[PDB]
């Protein structure tokens, strides 16, 4: 019920594995090239941006933010993304609860 | 004639899938 | 039936690109 | 210019990526189920074997051993193996 995503500094999907379809319903092609914020609930959207602003200054540290994800079937999913940085790219582990 | 193509391609896919499954496990592990 | 090999050649290309991306990642988070 | 191998506790190949063919000449089927020492130079078998006994006591820490690997064409290749443990052992086998 989780998938490994790989973003840049702004949060654009640069890589998504095959397990997204099972976890959110979207296909890798449907996620690639778009920001994760676009899929984030507007109510807790700023929070996602705040978490992403932090992983950048905290080079190497691991962070954890939980937010709502818009599934493919237009339904909200609480997603726990535990992300960190490598700056080259950002690795995210998006877990479904 | 072309059936031998689809057969070798279906197999090739199966191989690349098993590699993806193991590789994903490794990257999922080193976290 | 040519439409199979065409979509399989494509599918292979996608799965080939995925392992390269996966391998590059796993090779990185070892260092 | 290297490939990631994944062994068990004793060092038998449980997983090899496609890059074995370019770096060593062997195919994944040809390595799996087989011990890594079997491809090692008799001179450096003791070193590689001792190095494998070490990665376990290091618990997560990374070691580096250099040995000769017998390629498919029956020639020795100096290999820089950067290995550690997670259950299983992951190795980054570099060709120099």
Domains and CATH numbers, chain A: 1-97 (3.30.450.20)
- Residue in chain C closest to A16 (alpha carbons) equals C18
* A61 Ramachandran zone, left/alpha/beta (phi>0; psi -120 to 50): beta
Resolution value in angstroms: 3.2
Among B3, B5, B26, beta carbon nearest to C26 = B26
As a whole number of angstroms, the distance between CA D52 and CA D56 comes to 7
For D35-57, give one letter per residue: b (16+ CB within 10 A) or e: bbbebbbeebeeebbebbeebee
Q: Is D54 in CB contact (< 8 Å) with chain C?
A: no
* Strand A2-7 relative to strand A90-96, pairing: antiparallel
- Roughly how many angstroms between the first and final C-alpha of chain A, as a whole number? 8
Angle at B16 between CA C5 and CA C4, to 5 degrees: 10
Chains A and B form CB pairs within 8 A to the count of 9
As a whole number of angstroms, the distance between CA A72 and CA A28 comes to 12
| CB-based contact A87:A56 (threshold 8 Å) | yes
Q: In what order do the strands lie in the sheet with D89-95?
A: D13-16, D2-7, D89-95, D76-85, D63-70
Among B3, B6, B31, beta carbon nearest to C8 = B6
Does the beta-carbon distance from A18 to C25 stay under 8 Å?
no
β partners of residue D86? none
- Residue in chain C closest to A85 (alpha carbons) equals C29
Chains in contact with D, where contact means 3 or more Cβ–Cβ distances below 8 Å, are: B, C
For A9-47, give one letter per residue: b (16+ CB within 10 A) or e: eebbbebbbbbbbebbbbebeebeeebbbebbbeeeeee
Helix B3-29 to helix C2-28 angle (10° resolution) is 20
| CB-based contact D83:D89 (threshold 8 Å) | yes
- Residue in chain B closest to A2 (alpha carbons) equals B28
* Residue D33: half-sphere exposure toward Cβ, Cα within 13 Å: 4
3-state secondary structure of A9: coil
- Structure tokens that stand for A12 in this block: 């654009």
Domain coordinates in residue numbering, chain B: 1-31
CA A5 to chain C, closest CA, distance in angstroms equals 11
| CB-based contact D40:D69 (threshold 8 Å) | yes
As a whole number of angstroms, the distance between CA D31 and CA D20 comes to 9
What are the chain B neighbours of D86 within 8 Å (beta carbons)?
29-30
Among A15, A28, A86, beta carbon nearest to C29 = A86
As a whole number of angstroms, the distance between CA C21 and CA C14 comes to 11
Identify the DSSP state of A35: B
Does the beta-carbon distance from D86 to B19 stay under 8 Å?
no
β partners of residue D89? D7, D85
CB count within 10 Å of CB C27 equals 15
CA A14 to chain C, closest CA, distance in angstroms equals 10
CA dihedral C7, C17, D28, D71 (to 10 degrees): 130
Q: Is B18 in CB contact (< 8 Å) with chain D?
A: no
């Amino acid at each position: 019920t989780e998938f490994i995503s790989r973003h840049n500094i702004e949060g654009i999907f640069t890589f998504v594995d095959h397990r997204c379809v099972a976890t959110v319903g979207y296909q890798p092609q449907e996620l690639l090239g778009k920001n994760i914020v676009e899929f984030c609930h507007p109510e807790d959207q700023q929070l996602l941006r705040d978490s992403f602003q932090q992983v950048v200054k905290l080079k190497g540290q691991v962070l954890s933010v939980m937010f709502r994800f818009r599934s493919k079937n237009q339904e909200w999913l609480w997603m726990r993304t535990s992300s960190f940085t490598f700056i080259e790219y950002i690795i995210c582990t998006n877990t479904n609860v | 004639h072309l059936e031998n193509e689809v057969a070798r391609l279906k197999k090739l896919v199966g191989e690349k899938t098993k590699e993806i499954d193991e590789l994903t496990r490794i990257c999922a592990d080193l976290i």
